[PDB]
Every structure is written in structure tokens, then in C-alpha cells.
């Protein structure tokens, strides 16, 4: 094929008459392409790289193949670009196999219900908005909330669980970094190395200097690298960091392929852009292996405005929602989870049974905390039980705070919400409930955490032993 015109990362190509839609093509400059809109007179080819090396009249060869990435266990540990190619300087991907990036999601008969829990290690999530394996959960928030920090804590925590579970139920994580800085993702490879999570992590990095078709296609490349573990009976965890930056990369190609703009400028098919991708996160049936893929799309809002175009699409696609608020972030509540707006549609089906019976009371009390504090900040009057619910809900709000990169396993999370909901953290001052609960985990016997890990549930022979052990602790303030 001959290049008719070229500019802005689009090359209109004469000829190429047998080219397929979505097929990889190769320019004679070595830079690749993808035939996106086949027209009667030309082909519209989005260019995988810098379009300064393409000239008018250059030769375009079709590769014959739709766009594909190398999948397999040889991608584990490596940092690749938007299509497979590793950018960490460690040679080729050994022990790997190519497969298409646009695979049809498993249908109705290929699934089963989401029942196993996915522990993130964030107790504001693992108590109130719990996440099952095969569930897609939106981490939506404003500009610099804790959105990545929720998702990095879900990845680091899988390293802590993979050492303790058998080989079959290990979760292999994939972090797709779309439109970010290249040094921002270099800070995450350094964090995943010195924690050790890079043994189980693939990083698909389409940074801000990559071409707009490399950032549009990198969530699909990362989903294809993570669908390897779903299709072969293992468990995957995919995190698409800023799907709101993938859709801006999609809007750029759609406006330069002269597809007519819609809302804000976005193409019409931008719902189909994300629902094609998030529906690939599934819990498969046991005939297909019982494998699983859990998605965490990240969407950035502008001023807490979830009524945007891309925001309302992904809210409509995903099961749950982890809504992070910038005003809760600065009040000290970090993770800044809006407990009144954050949902989980799987809900009590796939949470920890040891915390299903504790965090039912926790959201029942925090729902009562919210409306009474709207009244009592005026300073009218207080009622000695209305005084109880805004004093108890302050014990629970400080309980769900957390530090940056320390995911709490699942048993030390449910003992702490036990000690906060069974009254053991009343008359402890509110300033050091964040400081009392290290004593509630360290001074309480380390072998009571093993029973609640092995049972998975507070047995009657354990609450009478644990609440005997939550009394022999030296709490600060008191």
C-alpha cells in the first residue's frame, strides 16, 4: 500500500485491498500500524509510534495478522509497553506465546457465580465494600485521592497471600499504566521490587509520550496478558489505571480518523470501548477451569463530578464502586472512602465469613453516624444516645484509617473491627484509636489469628476466647 497522506499519527493508505479491520500493518520505516477504518478509497491507519518517519508515497505492507501480544508466564516480572514489547532492558520475553488483544468475553454458560473473596488488605474496602474473585470494581475519585494507593495495596497484598495459600489459589496481578509519567511507573517497579510483588506482577506501561493507539490498546494488551491466568485455571487481578486516560487516547484517534464527535468530543462507541474490556473480567465455570480475573478500572473525576461521560459509563459497567473523596482525604480519613456512596454488588456473597458477621454491624452504625453529624455540627442539642452514635461512629471512622503500603491480612482486620464493634474501643480517646489498634494486634496472641484464618469464621469457641484476649491488652489513653 502507498501512503497517501500522513500527519497527527494517522496515515491514509492507498491500496491494501485485502487488509482486515483491526489488522496490524507495517510501514517501510519499521513503525507499525493498525488498519482501523477501511474506506472505499483509502485505509485509515493509526500509527504505533512517531509518524515523523512516514512520508507520502511510503510503502505499507500488511502483516496478515490482527493485533496480538505475547501472553504466558514469561510476562511475569517484566515491564512491557502497550503491545507486549518489554521496556525494562531485560532482553526478550522467554517462555511466552502470542494471542489476540481483542478476544470475545466469556458468555453466560462459561461463568459461575463470584464466591471466593479477593482480599485487598485495605480494611475500608475489605469490610464495607468487599470484592470477590471475578468482580470488576471501579476505583473512582478526584485528582489526588488515594486511587492508585488502593490498587497498589491490592497488588502488594496478593504477594503476602501467595506465600500462604496453596499454588492453585494464587492471584497474579497485572498493572496497566495508561497515560502516566514514565518515572511514575518507574517508582512502581521500584516499589514492587523491594516489596517482592514483582514476582507475580506484569506491568503494561503506555506512558504519556507513547502514541495514542498505544495507550488505547494497552488495557486490551494487559487484559490479554491477564486472561492467560483466567483461561488456565489460575486467578488474575488486572488494574487499569486511568481508563479515563485511555478514552482520551481513543478520542484522539477517533477525531483524527474523522469519526464524528459526540459527548464532550467522545466517539459514540466509547461505552463499547470499556464494556468490551471490563466484561473480560470473569469468574469462569469449573468446566473451563474455575479461573478468574478481577478488574479494577480507575476513573478520575474533575470536581467530584461523577456525572461525566466516561465516569457514568464505567459506573454502569462495573459491579461495585470505590468512591474516594478529596474532602474526606484531608480530614485524616485515608483511604478516603465515601462509605455512603461506595457499593459492592457482589456484597455479602464473597466476603470473609469472619468479617461478614462483624462488618454488617459496622455499616449499620456508620449509616447512623452520617446524618447525626450533619445536625450536630450546627451545635443545637445532643441526646445521650445521639451522643452515642456520633461518638461510636468516630471510633469506627478512625478504625478504618490505614497507612500507605501496609496491607493488613484479613484476620488482623476482622479482629480490629471486632474490638471496635464489640465495645472494646469505647472510652479510648479518638486521637489514638489509630494508635491503640497496633496493641490490639500485637498484644493479642498471634495464635488466635491462625484459628480465624483456618476457620474463616468466628466460632462460638473463639469469640469467648478472643474477647477474653481483648481484655488483657494495655490500651493508650484509656
Amino acid at each position: 500500500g502507498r501512503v497517501l497522506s500522513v500527519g497527527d499519527g494517522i496515515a491514509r493508505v492507498y491500496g491494501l485491498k485485502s487488509v482486515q479491520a483491526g489488522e496490524l500493518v507495517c510501514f517501510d520505516s519499521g513503525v507499525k500500524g493498525m488498519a482501523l477504518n477501511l474506506q472505499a478509497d483509502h485505509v485509515g491507519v493509526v500509527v504505533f509510534g512517531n509518524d515523523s518517519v512516514i512520508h507520502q508515497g511510503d510503502l505499507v505492507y500488511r502483516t496478515g495478522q490482527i493485533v496480538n501480544v505475547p501472553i504466558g508466564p514469561g510476562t511475569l516480572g517484566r515491564v512491557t509497553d502497550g503491545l507486549g514489547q518489554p521496556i525494562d532492558g531485560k532482553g526478550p520475553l522467554t517462555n511466552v506465546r502470542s494471542s489476540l488483544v481483542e478476544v470475545k468475553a466469556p458468555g453466560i454458560i462459561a461463568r459461575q457465580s463470584v464466591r471466593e473473596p479477593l482480599f485487598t488488605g485495605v480494611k475500608a474496602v475489605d469490610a464495607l465494600v468487599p470484592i470477590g474473585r471475578g468482580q470488576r470494581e471501579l476505583i473512582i475519585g478526584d485528582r489526588q485521592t488515594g486511587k492508585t494507593a488502593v490498587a497498589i495495596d491490592a497488588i502488594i497484598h496478593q504477594k503476602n497471600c501467595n506465600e500462604q495459600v496453596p499454588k492453585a489459589q494464587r492471584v497474579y496481578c497485572v498493572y496497566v499504566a495508561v497515560g502516566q509519567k514514565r518515572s511514575t511507573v518507574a517508582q512502581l517497579v521500584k516499589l514492587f521490587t523491594q516489596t517482592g510483588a514483582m514476582r507475580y506482577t506484569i506491568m503494561v506501561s503506555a506512558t504519556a509520550s507513547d502514541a495514542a493507539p498505544l495507550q488505547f490498546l494497552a488495557p486490551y494488551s494487559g487484559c490479554a496478558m491477564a486472561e492467560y491466568f483466567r483461561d488456565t485455571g489460575k486467578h488474575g487481578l488486572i488494574i487499569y489505571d486511568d481508563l479515563s486516560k485511555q478514552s482520551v487516547a481513543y478520542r484522539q484517534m477517533s477525531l483524527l480518523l474523522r469519526r464524528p464527535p459526540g459527548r464532550e468530543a467522545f466517539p459514540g462507541d466509547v461505552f463499547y470501548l470499556h464494556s468490551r474490556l471490563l466484561e473480560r473480567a470473569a469468574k469462569l465455570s469449573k468446566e473451563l477451569g474455575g479461573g478468574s480475573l478481577t478488574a479494577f478500572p480507575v476513573i478520575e473525576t474533575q470536581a467530584g463530578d461523577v456525572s461525566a461521560y466516561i465516569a457514568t459509563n464505567v459506573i454502569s459497567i462495573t459491579d461495585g464502586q470505590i468512591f474516594l473523596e478529596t474532602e474526606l482525604f484531608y480530614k485524616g480519613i485515608r483511604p478516603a472512602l465515601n462509605v455512603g456512596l461506595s457499593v459492592s454488588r457482589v456484597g455479602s456473597a464473597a466476603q470473609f465469613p469472619g468479617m461478614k458477621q462483624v462488618a454488617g454491624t459496622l455499616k449499620l452504625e456508620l449509616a447512623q453516624y452520617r446524618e447525626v453529624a450533619a445536625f450536630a455540627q450546627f451545635g443545637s442539642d445532643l441526646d445521650a444516645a445521639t451522643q452515642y452514635v456520633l461518638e461510636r461512629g468516630a471510633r469506627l471512622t478512625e478504625m478504618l484509617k490505614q497507612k500507605q503500603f501496609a496491607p493488613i491480612p484479613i484476620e488482623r482486620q476482622t479482629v480490629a473491627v471486632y474490638a471496635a464493634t464489640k465495645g472494646f474501643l469505647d472510652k479510648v480517646r479518638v486521637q489514638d484509636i489509630v494508635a491503640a489498634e497496633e496493641a490490639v494486634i500485637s498484644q493479642v496472641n498471634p495464635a488466635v489469628f491462625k484459628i480465624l484464618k483456618a476457620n474463616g469464621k468466628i466460632t462460638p469457641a473463639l469469640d469467648a476466647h478472643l474477647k477474653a484476649e481483648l481484655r488483657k491488652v494495655k490500651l493508650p489513653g484509656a
Binding site: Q302, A303, G304, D305, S307
Partner: peptide, 15 residues
């Protein structure tokens, strides 16, 4: 974000 302002006008007018 255009309906946050209309309900804030609602709140201020009822106050």
C-alpha cells in the same frame, strides 16, 4: 456538577 449548584441554591433558600 450543575445540579450540585441548583440544590445548593435550594438549601440556601430554605435556610
Amino acid at each position: 456538577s450543575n445540579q450540585a449548584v441548583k440544590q445548593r441554591i435550594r438549601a440556601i433558600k430554605n435556610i
